[PDB]
């Protein structure tokens, strides 16, 4: 897997993207690694905020399925043709693999300004595939055809680049222990949250709050997204834990940046945020922890910062805000997500994430999903 180390480019705003070679002769695209969807969907015509797209007419091995795909979502929508073609992953594999491909000809809040990717690699389960779960996924193609385990792992380093290890775990990407939490439902990478704690203090919410409709692990969502009730409670604990004159309301909702003398950094006065996850043994949990530096994110004479947590509707999305702290292990063969502390997850010689365990789950229900 050393061939797969540092194969990702980007940061949490560009996205983390992988160089993918499609068709014959090969056309090089930059593809967003997206654990929150299940289609290989690429740019099929030219379009604003992209330089390249995949031209299906210039590939002699391309084959059209003769139908279209349509995904409406809340932000917007995407529409493409569905086909098949040969792909390689040069930082990874020698050989080429025959896969399904959606070529996007029309969209809305899809290709948002300042992205460097011109497609999406959906690495979630068949169940999310569109138009239906019978459209074999890229990873299910690659497991079968490349003879790799049914596992991949991801490290983001933009807190530059990162690593997508298809096939396994690379030991030089983590130190300390992997802790694994069960995947509750194979669609998204849906996992069970038992508790959020801010500055040592747990929020006083029914653990059900953190899992209606779902808590997921999604490389394809920038921020830590929290159901409005949860968000509001995280914001209130963060500001009470802070003791220093308040942030603006505009800060907390994405509409304002807070700024300091390029010198007096804001990290010393903000609390830790810890998300507790159920271990494989249900009596036990483990906690993944982000310091201020991952959720109070930098964007001449002043350094400015955005809040790295936003509200959602039906989902607690563990996005890039959190995954930027951890080597995250998508062990589909064992129906579990693993987390270890990322060594690259360090700023000014301090670790910006922590993992520890084990703790008692004798205070929370036997199941926190509704």
């Amino acid at each position, epitope marked *: 897997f050393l061939a797969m180390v540092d194969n990702l480019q980007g940061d949490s705003g560009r996205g983390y993207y992988l160089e993918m070679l499609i068709g014959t002769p090969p056309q090089k695209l930059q593809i967003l690694v997206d654990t929150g969807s299940s289609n290989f969907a690429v740019a099929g015509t030219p379009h604003s905020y992209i330089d390249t797209y995949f031209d299906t007419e210039r590939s002699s091995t391309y*084959r059209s399925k003769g139908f279209d795909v349509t995904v409406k979502y809340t932000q917007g929508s995407w529409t493409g043709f569905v086909g098949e073609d040969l792909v390689t992953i040069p930082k990874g594999f020698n050989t080429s693999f025959l*896969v399904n491909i959606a070529t996007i000809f029309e969209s809305e809040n899809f290709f948002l300004p300042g992205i460097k990717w011109n497609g999406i690699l959906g690495l979630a389960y*068949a169940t999310l595939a569109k138009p239906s*779960s*019978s459209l074999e996924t890229f990873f299910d193609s690659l497991v*079968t055809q490349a*003879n790799i385990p049914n596992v991949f792992s991801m490290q983001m380093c933009g807190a530059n680049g990162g690593s997508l290890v298809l096939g396994g775990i690379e030991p030089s990407l983590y130190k300390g222990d992997i802790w694994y939490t069960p995947i509750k439902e194979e669609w998204y990478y849906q996992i069970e949250i038992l508790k959020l704690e801010i500055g040592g203090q747990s929020l006083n919410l029914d653990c059900r709050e953190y899992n209606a409709d779902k808590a997921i692990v999604d490389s394809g969502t920038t921020l830590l997204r929290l159901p409005q009730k949860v968000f509001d409670a995280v914001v209130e604990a963060v500001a009470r834990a802070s003791l220093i004159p308040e942030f603006s309301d505009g800060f907390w909702t994405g509409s304002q940046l807070a700024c300091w003398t390029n010198s007096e950094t804001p990290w010393s006065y903000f609390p830790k945020i810890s998300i507790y996850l159920r271990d494989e043994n249900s009596s036990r949990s483990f906690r993944i922890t982000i310091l201020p530096q991952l959720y109070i994110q930098p964007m001449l004479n002043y350094e400015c910062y955005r809040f790295g947590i936003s509200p959602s509707t039906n989902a607690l999305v563990i996005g890039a805000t959190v995954m930027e702290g951890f080597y995250v292990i998508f062990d589909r063969a064992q129906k579990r997500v693993g987390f270890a502390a990322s060594p690259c997850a360090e700023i000014a010689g301090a670790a910006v994430s922590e993992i520890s365990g084990p703790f008692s789950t004798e205070d929370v229900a036997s199941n926190c999903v509704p």
Partner: nanobody, 113 residues
Framework: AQVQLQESGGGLVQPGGSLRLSCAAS????????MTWVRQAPGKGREWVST????????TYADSVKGRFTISRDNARNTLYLQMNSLKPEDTAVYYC?????RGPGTQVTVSS
């Protein structure tokens, strides 16, 4: 989309022998699915054999069976095939068909001297 799959046609052959495997599909639009043949012998690693794209024109093979095996399909009959000549004892295994995540039960191929 209940992708149901059922392979047939394995058996016990000699070196230099031949077989032809089939795989019947139901549950899904066979005519629009990429179809793959994989093999598993006991005590070994899973090994890809061959893939075919949905309209049949696109076919790839593992170096270990290139020019000995041929994959084909019949869309009108929702059936996948694999013709296997020049059989070697290393070809021994359970051969199965996989699509979208799902597989049939497999069919046994034994090349015993």
């Amino acid at each position: 989309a209940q992708v149901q799959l059922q392979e047939s046609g394995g058996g016990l052959v000699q070196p230099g022998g031949s077989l032809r495997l089939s795989c019947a599909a139901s549950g899904f639009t066979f005519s629009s699915a990429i179809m793959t043949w994989v093999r598993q012998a006991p005590g070994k690693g899973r090994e890809w054999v061959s893939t075919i794209g949905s309209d049949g024109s696109i076919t790839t093979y593992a170096d270990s069976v290139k020019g000995r095996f041929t994959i084909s399909r019949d869309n009108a009959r929702n059936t996948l095939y694999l013709q296997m000549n020049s059989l070697k004892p290393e070809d021994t295994a359970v051969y199965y068909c996989t699509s979208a995540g799902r597989r049939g039960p497999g069919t046994q191929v034994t090349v015993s001297s």
